[PDB]
Design a protein around this nucleic acid. Sequence first.
RNA 1: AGCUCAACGAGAACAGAAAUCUCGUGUGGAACAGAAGGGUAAAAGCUCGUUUGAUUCUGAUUUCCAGUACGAAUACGAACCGUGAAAGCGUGGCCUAACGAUCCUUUAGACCUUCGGAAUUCGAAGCUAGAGGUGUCAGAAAAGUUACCACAGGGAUAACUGGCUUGUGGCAGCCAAGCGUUCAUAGCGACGUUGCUUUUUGAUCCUUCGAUGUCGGCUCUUCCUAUCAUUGUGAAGCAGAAUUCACCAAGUGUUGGAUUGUUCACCCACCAAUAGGGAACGUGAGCUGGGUUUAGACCGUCGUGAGACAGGUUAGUUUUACC
RNA 2: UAUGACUCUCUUAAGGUAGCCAAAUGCCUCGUCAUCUAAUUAGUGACGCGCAUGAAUGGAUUAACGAGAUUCCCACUGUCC
RNA 3: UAUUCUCAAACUUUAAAUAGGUAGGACGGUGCGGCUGCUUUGUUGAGCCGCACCACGGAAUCAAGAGCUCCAAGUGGGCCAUUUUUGGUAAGCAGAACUGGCGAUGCGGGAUGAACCGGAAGCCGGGUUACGGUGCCAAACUGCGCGCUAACCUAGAUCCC
RNA 4: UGCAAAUCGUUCGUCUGACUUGGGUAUAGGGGCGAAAGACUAAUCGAACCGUCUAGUAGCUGGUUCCCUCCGAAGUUUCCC
RNA 5: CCCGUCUUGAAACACGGACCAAGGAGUCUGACAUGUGUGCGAGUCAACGGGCGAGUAAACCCGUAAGGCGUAAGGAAGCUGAUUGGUGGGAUCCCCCUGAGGGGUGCACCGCCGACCGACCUUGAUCUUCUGUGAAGGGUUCGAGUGUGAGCAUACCUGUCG
RNA 6: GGAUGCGAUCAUACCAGCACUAACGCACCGGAUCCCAUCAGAACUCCGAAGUUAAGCGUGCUUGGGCGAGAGUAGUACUAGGAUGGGUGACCCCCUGGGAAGUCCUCGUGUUGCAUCCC
Lengths: 103, 49, 186, 98, 163
Amino acid sequence: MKHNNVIPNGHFKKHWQNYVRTWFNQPARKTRRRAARQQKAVKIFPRPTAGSLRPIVHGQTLKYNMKVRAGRGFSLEELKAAGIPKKLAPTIGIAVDHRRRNR
Amino acid sequence: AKSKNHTAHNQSYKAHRNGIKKPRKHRHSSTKGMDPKFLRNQRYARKHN
Amino acid sequence: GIDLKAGGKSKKTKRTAPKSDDVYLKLLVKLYRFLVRRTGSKFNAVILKRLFMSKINKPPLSLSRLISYAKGKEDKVVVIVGTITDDVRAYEVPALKVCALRFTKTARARIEKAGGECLTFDQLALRAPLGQNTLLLRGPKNAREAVKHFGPAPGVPHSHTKPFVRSKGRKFERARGRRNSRGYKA
Amino acid sequence: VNVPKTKKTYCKSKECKKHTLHKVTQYKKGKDSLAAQGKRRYDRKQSGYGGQTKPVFHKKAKTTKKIVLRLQCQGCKHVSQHPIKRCKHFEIGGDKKG
Amino acid sequence: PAGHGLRSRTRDSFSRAFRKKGTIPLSTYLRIFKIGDYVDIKVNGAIHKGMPHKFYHGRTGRVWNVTKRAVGVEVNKQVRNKILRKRIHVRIEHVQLSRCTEEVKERMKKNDQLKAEAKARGEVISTKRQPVGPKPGFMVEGATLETVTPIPYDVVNDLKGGY
RNA sequence: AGCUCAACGAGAACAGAAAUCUCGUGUGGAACAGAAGGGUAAAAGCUCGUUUGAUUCUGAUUUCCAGUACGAAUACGAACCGUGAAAGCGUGGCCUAACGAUCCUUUAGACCUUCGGAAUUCGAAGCUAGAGGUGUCAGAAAAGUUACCACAGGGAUAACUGGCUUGUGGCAGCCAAGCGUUCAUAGCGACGUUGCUUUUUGAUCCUUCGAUGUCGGCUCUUCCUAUCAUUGUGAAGCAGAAUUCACCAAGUGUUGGAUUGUUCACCCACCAAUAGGGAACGUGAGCUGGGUUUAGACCGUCGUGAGACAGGUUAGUUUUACC
RNA sequence: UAUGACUCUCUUAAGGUAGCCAAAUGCCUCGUCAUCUAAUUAGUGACGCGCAUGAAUGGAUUAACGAGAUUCCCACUGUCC
RNA sequence: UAUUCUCAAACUUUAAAUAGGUAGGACGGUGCGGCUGCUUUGUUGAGCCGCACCACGGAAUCAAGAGCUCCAAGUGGGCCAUUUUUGGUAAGCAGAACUGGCGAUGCGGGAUGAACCGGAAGCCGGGUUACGGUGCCAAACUGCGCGCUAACCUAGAUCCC
RNA sequence: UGCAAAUCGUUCGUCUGACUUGGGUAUAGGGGCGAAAGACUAAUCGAACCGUCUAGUAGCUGGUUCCCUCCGAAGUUUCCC
RNA sequence: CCCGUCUUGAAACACGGACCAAGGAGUCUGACAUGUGUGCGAGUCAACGGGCGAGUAAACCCGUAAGGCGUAAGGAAGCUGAUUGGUGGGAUCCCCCUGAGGGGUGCACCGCCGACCGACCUUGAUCUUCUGUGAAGGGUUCGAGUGUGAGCAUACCUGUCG
RNA sequence: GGAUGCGAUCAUACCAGCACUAACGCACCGGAUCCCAUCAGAACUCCGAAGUUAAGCGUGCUUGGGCGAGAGUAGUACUAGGAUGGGUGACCCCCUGGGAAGUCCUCGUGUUGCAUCCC
Ligand SMILES: [K+]
Ligand SMILES: [K+]
Ligand SMILES: [K+]
Ligand SMILES: [K+]
Ligand SMILES: [K+]
Ligand SMILES: [K+]
Ligand SMILES: [K+]
Ligand SMILES: [K+]
Ligand SMILES: [K+]
Ligand SMILES: [K+]
Ligand SMILES: [K+]
Ligand SMILES: [K+]
Ligand SMILES: [K+]
Ligand SMILES: [K+]
Ligand SMILES: [K+]
Ligand SMILES: [K+]
Ligand SMILES: [K+]
Ligand SMILES: [K+]
Ligand SMILES: [K+]
Ligand SMILES: [K+]
Ligand SMILES: [Mg+2]
Ligand SMILES: [Mg+2]
Ligand SMILES: [Mg+2]
Ligand SMILES: [Mg+2]
Ligand SMILES: [Mg+2]
Ligand SMILES: [Mg+2]
Ligand SMILES: [Mg+2]
Ligand SMILES: [Mg+2]
Ligand SMILES: [Mg+2]
Ligand SMILES: [Mg+2]
Ligand SMILES: [Mg+2]
Ligand SMILES: [Mg+2]
Ligand SMILES: [Mg+2]
Ligand SMILES: [Mg+2]
Ligand SMILES: [Mg+2]
Ligand SMILES: [Mg+2]
Ligand SMILES: [Zn+2]
């Protein structure tokens, strides 16, 4: 070691050359996923390709509580208030989440 | 196996390759290390100048 | 033999032409070579010399600083061999005649909206062949991160040089040599 | 060396901030506590197999220690610590020289 | 430290002059020191406080600070390939006002007067002093000439006072 | 604040070289903790009075020096004090040495910060300053032996020769106090003093450690002279005989044996004589292998032991030429 | 004269007894005496404050044996002259 | 008591040579006014700040120019010489001071040689030299002059040697 | 640089026993086995052989590939088992 | 005098080299750093992914309050958080006169000294939920801070390190 | 021309032996109640004015010591630079420069600032 340089801390003391993951298949993965999406769309026709409807939920923690994103599924309380039986919602394209509480 | 212990041979030639450098003296020199009371009074005088 | 250093030859290196391959910059260099040769103007010589310099030696000038330096000299054409960037801290933009190598889109829009004009150095030569009635300005050369790490070593007395650290925090170079309670301070 | 039983010295307690009478005693290192984080870490490291995991100093060289005087201000009862130079024989309140 | 004490090799340097020991004359404490004054550093071996390092003994510097009992002195010191302006504090007993610039002010005043006189009479002059140059020719009056010849050698005179 | 020390001179019963006391002289010839060097006389020394500046806060500088740290020291600033009538002095010892990082532990300080769901209390963890220590003293936690041995290297480094040197060894000269029945010099040469040699032993480490075969003897040749014998001479305390000193002189020769591995040494015997030496301390692809100097083994001394041994003992592979 | 049968003591419990020796064990050392030879640093016998011998870490001796280490004599010889 | 022989790295009154430090203006001077919580018995001083005037560049020589910054290589075995100099009998020994040289460098001379003398260098023509030489080897006189030496010891024959 | 990675010639020890020898069988690597030499354990033994970790690490030795042009050193300071 | 090498010193009685052909040794990758080229700029970076598209591993397009770096620092922490300068040199330009002149202009960079933010110390009118606030007034203390931004992406040589 | 009080320089001012001094001073000097101080009213402290210039202080002299200056030592010792200088060496000459110190001899023995006073 010599000169004024940042102290090196490279983590390369194991057999790292046997655990290198390359990305030469990235275009192939994109093509395969597009083909899967097209096949699914053909299968579920005429159901929407975007999938089942999802709820609107807040972001977790103080860093993202101002943000609104998509949740896993609608709560049982929300389904009851909307008049949609919970056993019917999944069959008509509505995701159901029996865990989410409404505060 | 013993070796040489010390010598100043060639050191003056090395010093004179680029030296002897005299730092340029500016009109105003730093006041660090001067009597703190005098510096305090000078600062107040400058403030009220 | 002759008692001379390096046979009387110079050992200093300076730029004699741009290192860039920009054809427009080359044309500007030809223009100002001709101007320097056939006019002997100090302004033209300075412009020619600065045209050769590297990127870090042509620092940008902010719009707010340009306005501050042009205060009371709005009638003069302000010239900078470099880039002019916009400043969101500057509220009132007067009408300025500004010549520069490049303008950012926001800075150009603000200058043109204020009623000024943005000029290239060929237009400057057409307007001020000898640099008459100009305000030659330079950006802050030493205001960059790399400069902070230059100078005396961080570990010597009276030194405020920034050290090279991979991260900032209590565990990153704050214990020994930085405190009276851990060995020595500085 | 012999030091007096009492000493008049500066006290930086907010109550005094001046010279006050102090009683002089000798500082003694307190007993090591098993709850100290360093001791807990050392005990965890020593447990299991591997033998001694930290150095054990052997090459003792000093023949004396630095005596620390505990000066307890008689006004505010607070304590200040004052080291003295190395000595082999130390005593407090010994008979004055004749 | 590192093999040499602070006052190593000062047997002669820090000793006092022969038949000049004892009490210090009052003139030492009556001197006035001001910023910018040139002073000579001469260690008084009888004053052990505010003693400069032996290196600064016999060197001339400029005053940059004035405390109650001491004066700050800036002394040039050569370290390898550069000169360092080392700032030290020294008690007035170890320092003496320097005469290295005694004639400067006088010469400047005379140069100004001569230049003013030349301007009054409409002439251009140079006030620079010059090194001693060759003298002109002159006539020397003849006098009696004493002849000098080499001395015949005598071995008995090879010793001081004779053998 | 007061006083002046060592020493000397002249005086006072025991009292004298040396007890205490009086006067005079007294530039430090005393003392100042220690080594030495500086420094100090109404003091820095001796006596007495009052005291704890050996105190608190951080910064600056010097020495070291990379102009890093530690140690030590210096000059200011901001407080509280000691002493003195006061100026003033005092931030340990008259000055130049007397000492110590990280981590951890431990002590002192705050109506101080944190234990991350919220409170209180223990406990723990933080901040500032010391203490427990690294003397290999910029700071690992550390016993031997190897002849059963191994590897990377080193001619940066020993054990031969060779090279410089010649203390030591050896071999010569100069002066002349003396010896020699008298007589310094036939023959010697004390006290001193000038040299030569590299067959002694030392000193050194230049060449050789990807190797120049390490004692002695045997055989064989050549070379030197500082000449033992032999040829020719000068001198004598040379009557003869014998002997001794010296000069040309290296042509010729310088032996057979007992003990010892021996070089060396010491005896027996002959002989004209049984002189001294070199040649990589000549010479192992010329021999030999008794000794030194691998591995086996015994003794003595040493070591708890493995083992050691400028001690002794016995057995222990000597390769290749046709360039 | 010398030594010490005898008495008392110190370290550390004792203080080398019977034996044996310049030994396969002794530095000085090629020890001293006798013998062997013309001549012996070899061999043998003897002596012993023995650097540093000694009692199953066994001491002393010992017939018979040994491709074991050593000295001498006869015979024998090209080992040698 | 007055003289006297001879002495000192760790003695000294005295005390060189060489070498060491400082200064020789435009960052100067003069006269007024102002600021201060510092200082004084005292606008007494100490610094600093404005205004006005003067300032021929204030010794010589040189100046193939001066200053500043960034990144980084190799090196961290040296050796030799005049003079100074320590240990050692001495050493082609061992260790220091200044300077130069070799190492890293050829070239002419010293027959030969890392260090001596001369001198440092692009490829060539001409001229002239340095050190050293001019009897042959071998370019240049057996050149012009004065003395000494005769070696029957291998006479003698050029800093380091 | 052999007939031979231990052989050949002469000589030599023992030879009814603790004798010599074939085959079968058991003991396998920090293990075996050893009338004990650190001997032997497939020409390998003071820790066999085979593959792998493995391109083990070396402040040490040896090499390190075209041209011209310009500049051009250091063997000195401090710290470091 | 035989090259190469180590060396103070090699033609060496120092090591490698009998000869020829072919092969044969500072590379690739990750983290930084200076320098330079290029784009944009208080921003910068679409290639995690998505829409597509040379019937296509390319190219093209896409950032919702995404994310990285930068845009604010000082404290162990609780926590607080930049009042916006002066001056001596100084490039360029503009005037008066042609002196090494005077006046105005005063970017870059350097020297010096204030001010602001924060750690520490000190200080304290008024309000206030009684522990907070902060008129005035500070400091030989400390900072990898502020005083009209300079970064982000990318290419290559060089250097340290795995 | 001096003295005294406070000094500067710190021997040309010091040391020793002799001689002298008008006036004012400075002193010696008389006591111990008080403040103060000791073995000691010697010293220190306080209160005084009888007596004396005897001493101190001051001045002068010594073929005096010391001290200071000069001359000389001496262009000597030493020393920076040069030589393909001499010499076996030890050492030394020469060229371009710098340049001391005892002994011996001669001279001199303080100069001064502010304030008060005498003459
Ligand atoms: K770097
Ligand atoms: K463990
Ligand atoms: K003190
Ligand atoms: K160490
Ligand atoms: K071992
Ligand atoms: K000799
Ligand atoms: K050798
Ligand atoms: K070798
Ligand atoms: K023989
Ligand atoms: K055998
Ligand atoms: K015992
Ligand atoms: K038995
Ligand atoms: K046998
Ligand atoms: K290095
Ligand atoms: K094994
Ligand atoms: K190494
Ligand atoms: K090599
Ligand atoms: K070779
Ligand atoms: K962003
Ligand atoms: K803090
Ligand atoms: Mg356990
Ligand atoms: Mg006193
Ligand atoms: Mg400590
Ligand atoms: Mg702790
Ligand atoms: Mg006779
Ligand atoms: Mg002869
Ligand atoms: Mg012969
Ligand atoms: Mg034993
Ligand atoms: Mg017995
Ligand atoms: Mg027996
Ligand atoms: Mg000197
Ligand atoms: Mg030369
Ligand atoms: Mg030519
Ligand atoms: Mg975001
Ligand atoms: Mg009188
Ligand atoms: Mg006299
Ligand atoms: Zn208190």
